[PDB]
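Why do we bother with holo predictions? Because pocket geometry can differ from the apo form. Keep that in mind while you read this record for cholesterol hemisuccinate.
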Amino acid sequence: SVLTMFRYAGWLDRLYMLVGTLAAIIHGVALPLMMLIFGDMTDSFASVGQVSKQSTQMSEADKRAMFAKLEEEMTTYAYYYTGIGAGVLIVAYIQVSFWALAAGRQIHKIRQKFFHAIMNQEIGWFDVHDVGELNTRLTDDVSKINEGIGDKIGMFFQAMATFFGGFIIGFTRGWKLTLVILAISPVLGLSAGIWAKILSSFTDKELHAYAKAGAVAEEVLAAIRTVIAFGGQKKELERYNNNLEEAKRLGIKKAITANISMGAAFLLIYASYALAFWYGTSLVISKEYSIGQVLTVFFSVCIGAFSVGQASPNIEAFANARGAAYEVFKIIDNKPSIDSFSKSGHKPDNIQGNLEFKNIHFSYPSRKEVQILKGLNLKVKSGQTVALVGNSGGGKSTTVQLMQRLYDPLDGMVSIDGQDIRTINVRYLREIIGVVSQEPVLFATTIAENIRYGREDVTMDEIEKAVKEANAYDFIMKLPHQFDTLVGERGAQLSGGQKQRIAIARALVRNPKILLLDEATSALDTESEAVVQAALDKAREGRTTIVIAHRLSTVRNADVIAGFDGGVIVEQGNHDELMREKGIYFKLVMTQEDVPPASFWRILKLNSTEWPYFVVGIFAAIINGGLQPAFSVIFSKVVGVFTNGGPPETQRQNSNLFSLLFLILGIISFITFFLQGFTFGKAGEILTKRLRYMVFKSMLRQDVSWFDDPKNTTGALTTRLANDAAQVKGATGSRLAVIFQNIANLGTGIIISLIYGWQLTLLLLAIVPIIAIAGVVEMKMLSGQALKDKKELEGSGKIATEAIENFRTVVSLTREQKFETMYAQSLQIPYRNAMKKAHVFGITFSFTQAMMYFSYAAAFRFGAYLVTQQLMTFENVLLVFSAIVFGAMAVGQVSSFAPDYAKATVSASHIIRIIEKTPEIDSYSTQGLKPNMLEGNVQFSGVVFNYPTRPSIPVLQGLSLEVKKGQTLALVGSSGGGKSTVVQLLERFYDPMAGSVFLDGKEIKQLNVQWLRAQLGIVSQEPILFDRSIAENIAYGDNSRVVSYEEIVRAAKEANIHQFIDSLPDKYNTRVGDKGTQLSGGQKQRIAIARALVRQPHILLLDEATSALDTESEKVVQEALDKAREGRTVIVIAHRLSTIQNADLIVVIQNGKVKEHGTHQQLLAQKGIYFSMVSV
Ligand SMILES: CC(C)CCC[C@@H](C)[C@H]1CC[C@H]2[C@@H]3CC=C4C[C@@H](OC(=O)CCC(=O)O)CC[C@]4(C)[C@H]3CC[C@]12C
Ligand SMILES: CC(C)CCC[C@@H](C)[C@H]1CC[C@H]2[C@@H]3CC=C4C[C@@H](OC(=O)CCC(=O)O)CC[C@]4(C)[C@H]3CC[C@]12C
Ligand SMILES: CC(C)CCC[C@@H](C)[C@H]1CC[C@H]2[C@@H]3CC=C4C[C@@H](OC(=O)CCC(=O)O)CC[C@]4(C)[C@H]3CC[C@]12C
Ligand SMILES: CC(C)CCC[C@@H](C)[C@H]1CC[C@H]2[C@@H]3CC=C4C[C@@H](OC(=O)CCC(=O)O)CC[C@]4(C)[C@H]3CC[C@]12C
Ligand SMILES: CC(C)CCC[C@@H](C)[C@H]1CC[C@H]2[C@@H]3CC=C4C[C@@H](OC(=O)CCC(=O)O)CC[C@]4(C)[C@H]3CC[C@]12C
Ligand SMILES: Nc1ncnc2c1ncn2[C@@H]1O[C@H](COP(=O)(O)OP(=O)(O)OP(=O)(O)O)[C@@H](O)[C@H]1O
Ligand SMILES: Nc1ncnc2c1ncn2[C@@H]1O[C@H](COP(=O)(O)OP(=O)(O)OP(=O)(O)O)[C@@H](O)[C@H]1O
Ligand SMILES: [Mg+2]
Ligand SMILES: [Mg+2]
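The structure, written out:
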């Protein structure tokens, strides 16, 4: 389970990682070979050169000779170092490039496999789980795995190789002593293991919190219109904030525990240093060990221990990857019972559909206590039409879902031609099914592509034939871009009837043997319904149909009608047989970018409130970062005091003071490392929480037209927020802390060299530009593709989210493979850029390391000229060189910061742009008139409006209408005529191009936006709920006020939904599904009606609030509204005749214009359009 990742390596990734590990081992061993010349060899000649120099030895004749000898040996070692520089160049690329190449390939396969696993789950699995977390897992956790399985493992292996090189060199030069030094290595190993395990657990919890935050964001952004209409921005921001607070506290805990562990680790390592130094002093005083021997072993083990210490961020990244892999591979390992990707099962050649439901018992997985079907029995013969009639929630849509095997029955059997559908192949079974759902859902693509999801290889002639049969041909040809016009998310940029007709055509192109039509004409007008019904009846002979309808005209011509009661069929037979049996059908019928370079810095300004955390951390960065180079200087005293120590007692005292100093340095290192990690980590967590909060608030501030933009889809927005926050976080925190430490390491070197040797400091002037340019050029590349990589990423996150939100449609259309192919295609450009980065970062790291070895060689050469010319002491040369190597050991980590900084800068620029964005219709604005009283007069005067996504099409052409308090306005007309546009404009979702809208004679642009929307109670054409309880969904109707239980129950009673909630276990605490899919269509609509009514609004806007209701439920809701007619102004959009005649005034809208206005009797008196609609 620990090594559950690397599952998809394969032979190529296994060889990329074997060869890279060998290259890392060679690169690591290159550094103890550097130390091999110290202590002895070069330093054997040195403590021989001046400490053991003769006071005078014909120095005028032979000191020049040993200086030349040391000139000659230094030149040889300079050649050796140039060779090592070339070798390190080669091995450093292979290490870094191959490791990132393998990480990139594995991450590509992991993303594909995780998406495939999500697409393989059952409908019940989606019902039980909160799938809004899945896109956050796709974007955040996979990137967390990527940073722990890549070149960081190569760096860890290089550090381990350097440590082992010091290990062998110490034992070769002198054992028993390096045993004392390295006997504490198991303690550090256990400490690192515990550290990593705690980091992994904290990462798992933090990713859970971030996934919950992403689920909240996805739910809110998907239903943004409902949030805006009901003024829910503050509360949704608050739920998002609660998840962010959980993530922030987890991150702070992680930082504290990790840093206290690391500080204890360094306290232990310096205590070990002190004990080892005492032991070495004892040995060297005993004369068992020469001073050079202890020098060599100490220095060799010291560099290896320093490499191990610098390896810690790699272990942290590996632990974070392990913490991230948990949920991803848990989902990947899940196996569904109803497998749609299985190749098993029967595929009959010729099917003459004989549908049978025998003794069907079903309870939904998420509400298993509730029985929906109790021994349901139904038979459908080939070529026959069955009409399922009954009250809302009876289980008709449940039967439709069971027919396509979205769930298995608890008891009983669903059979085709006497064969159990469990034994049939799932994909084959669902491919011969054409289905139109109760509330059709489209995809964010073109009309032609939406229809092509029904059948992939359908030609344009068959698409035209289907849209002619679906009565969608005319409006498609009328609008520009023809079939290539792109519909909104879920088809939101079409009218309800247009979307329904598109879904009908999508079902028709399948050429299905079995057609399920769950209220396929709910959003249609009378003429469209009639023509679509004629088209369907034209081809009823070769196919079996199960139709659900609340319109009696469609049920009239059905071959057989089945009535639902108590979960069973009570009446089945012919229309005349049903009239004669006087059943339930009897009662039913009599009820007739710029990317500014300073952007990242600006983001850091947003963290300025945490300035005291930074300064302390900066100090903690200056001290310990300056300690590693200064470790040389004091160590120069360590030998220097000992060599001139003289008597054994004086040397013993000096060495025990040195050991005490080492212990003090360990205490200081514990303190400073804990502070440097903790302060920067806490500042980073605070910054990330603040940035996420601000970005979500800005997104909730934006206009409706902004969400209508094709770039601003729900998946794109969620991916944008998560990715920008993560990329900015990548450059802040402990990462920035270690960068500051490394900068201190590199910085103290200049000063200490300047005191000790100034000429050699000129090399830093020659060494730093050459590295620096190598840094900036990569800056230009990794930035340029990052702007692309994010954009493409926003595409991929779109495809996944559209697939996860619309999963039931995808499964019904058998389009899991198509969406997987699109998701794989959207990953191509990022995957190629990941392969390009491997070589680019491999080359850069390789060049930087060579340059260090090349500078080392130059220093040794430069050093000799100085010594052969008596310009500097050799001891000073060695001290300066040790300073340079200790300072430069962190240059690799500094260069590794380049990929993070560019991504952070780009994401910072995007975050700054989104926060500063100001909408045209600002919902957060406190400006605007708030009238003391509201009379309820609504007027439209010459309103002309074009939707921003399709500005060439005029939707409203001088629309004018009036409605007063106590009056009911009934907007009727054909589909797509602009009825919902009026309600959207009254909510100030958009502003009209011309004309005006008045509320009590005051133009609504002058009014406060929130105040204006608070006077409105809206029921949208296709209502959307939240993944919350019924009580919370109703109480959403009046935010900024705590709605009591009594008011919620009263609203539910007014909406005729109270009885269903009360009978339901958990009652008002029953969690509804995502967007209300775990309810009946009529139940969800009634919940929406209760949500609008609990507000008690002055203007009630009902956009077909009774489309999915029963006749009895419609009657109850209508009488409830009638009892509260006076005292409010009501605007009603309805295709039902019975809801229109009681309205005070009726407006017929065609082509954005009023054609007929007046009462029911007046419109019936003249033989106009209204009479035509009535007669049909
Ligand atoms: C020690 C250094 C100097 C030599 C390089 C190590 C080689 C032993 C390895 C590591 C890189 C490998 C190559 C990396 C790239 C490819 C492409 C790769 O192409 C595919 O995988 C194609 C797609 C498919 O096969 O379906 C085939 C192996 C090959 C030639 C590899 C062959 C074996 C190589 C040369
Ligand atoms: C011997 C010294 C001079 C070092 C230089 C070696 C290169 C000249 C060779 C050895 C390593 C090879 C590379 C090893 C791996 C890759 C990545 C490989 O792409 C992948 O990662 C495969 C999967 C994918 O591309 O999707 C394409 C070939 C390439 C660049 C190989 C091209 C030839 C390279 C660079
Ligand atoms: C502390 C951090 C920075 C470094 C950790 C290094 C090791 C813990 C990693 C690095 C490379 C990994 C290996 C890379 C590839 C494979 C092959 C792969 O083998 C399988 O078991 C495959 C299973 C399958 O294919 O179904 C996964 C395990 C293994 C040995 C991995 C085991 C864990 C290893 C040794
Ligand atoms: C884009 C550029 C800057 C990158 C390529 C840099 C190389 C061309 C440089 C980097 C370090 C240089 C080396 C630094 C030091 C030495 C040692 C030097 O040794 C002697 O002259 C000593 C001879 C003696 O006294 O016995 C010879 C040149 C050499 C190999 C240099 C050769 C040229 C090197 C490899
Ligand atoms: C860090 C690298 C990658 C870029 C910069 C390289 C320089 C720092 C190197 C390359 C050429 C080197 C020089 C090449 C030759 C000489 C002459 C050399 O003279 C001798 O020792 C020769 C015998 C004699 O003294 O007569 C003294 C060092 C010096 C100045 C070297 C000093 C270091 C230099 C300037
Ligand atoms: N996914 C689900 N999880 C739990 N219960 C569900 C789910 N879908 C529907 N139900 C419940 O199952 C019952 C049957 O509802 P169903 O959707 O079958 O109604 P319908 O008869 O087709 O009615 P209408 O046409 O009014 O929507 C209701 O109590 C409903 O809330
Ligand atoms: N967000 C949008 N972007 C672009 N065009 C839109 C958008 N919403 C609706 N339209 C288009 O505006 C026109 C009127 O749509 P509207 O929803 O107002 O019609 P309607 O009369 O309510 O229709 P129906 O009875 O079918 O629900 C149609 O052509 C529709 O496709
Ligand atoms: Mg239904
Ligand atoms: Mg509409």
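The first strand starts at residue 355 and ends at 362.
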